[PDB]
Amino acid sequence: AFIRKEAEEKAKEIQLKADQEYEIEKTNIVRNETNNID
């Protein structure tokens, strides 16, 4: 039970961090590409 809950929590945190990393990388890559074009 604790293994299942810990695994689910780890996977959930991994997913949240995944989406967050997606948005952050979006803004960062946007700024970088804009800087390159400029």
Binding site: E6, K10, E13, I14
Partner: protein, 205 residues
């Protein structure tokens, strides 16, 4: 124009070294330190420099490689690791932090797996542009991944515990093969970053 100067005892005070360095836009120095140890080709990172490096960076940008960036990053890592060597030789290896230790380990990795290439070998005898560029890029990627992992609150040693695979893989990039299979190397680098992600997953927990 490639001209060899043979000063007495390798001293730069010799007329040869000065007169040569004066009219030269580029100079590649030879050290007797790693040559006496029967180690590979010896060149001083604190001595050898080139004034043609700028236009060379402009020319290497034609292949969309990063000459200047990788060279400056590796040179900075080399200088910081040299200062770290002076400090470690001064006090000790227990007086440093995780980042400095990572810089020293990266210095050793760059010394064994990059600057040193066997000319008698059937692989390291000749290194292509794409091979060295991919090697420096993968090295920079592993360095950035390790630096980012150290900023996550993980120790350098603890990070180096599960990274043995990526280390042996980084040290195995010297052999490789002919022009075919560059994709296997770049892909191996991708597998290295992925391995870093797996390690991050392992840490939590």
């Amino acid at each position: 124009i490639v001209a060899a100067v043979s000063p007495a005892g390798g001293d730069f005070s010799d007329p040869v070294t000065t007169a040569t360095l004066g009219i030269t836009q580029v100079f590649w120095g030879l050290d007797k330190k790693l040559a006496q140890r029967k180690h590979f080709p010896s060149i001083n990172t604190s001595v050898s420099y080139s004034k043609y490096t700028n236009v060379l960076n402009k020319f290497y940008d034609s292949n969309y490689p990063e000459f200047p960036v990788l060279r400056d990053r590796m040179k900075e890592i080399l200088s910081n690791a040299e200062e770290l060597e002076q400090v470690v030789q001064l006090v000790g290896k227990s007086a440093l932090s995780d980042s400095d230790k990572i810089t020293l380990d990266v210095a050793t990795l760059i010394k064994e797996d990059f600057l040193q290439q066997n000319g008698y070998s059937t692989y390291d005898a000749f290194c292509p542009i794409w091979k060295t560029f991919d090697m420096m890029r993968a090295f920079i990627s592993y360095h950035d991944e390790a630096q980012k992992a150290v900023a996550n609150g993980a120790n350098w040693s603890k990070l180096a515990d599960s990274t043995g695979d990526v280390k042996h893989a980084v040290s195995s990039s010297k052999f490789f093969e002919p022009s075919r299979g560059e994709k296997e190397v770049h892909g191996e680098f991708e597998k290295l970053l992925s391995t870093m992600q797996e390690r991050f997953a392992e840490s939590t927990d």
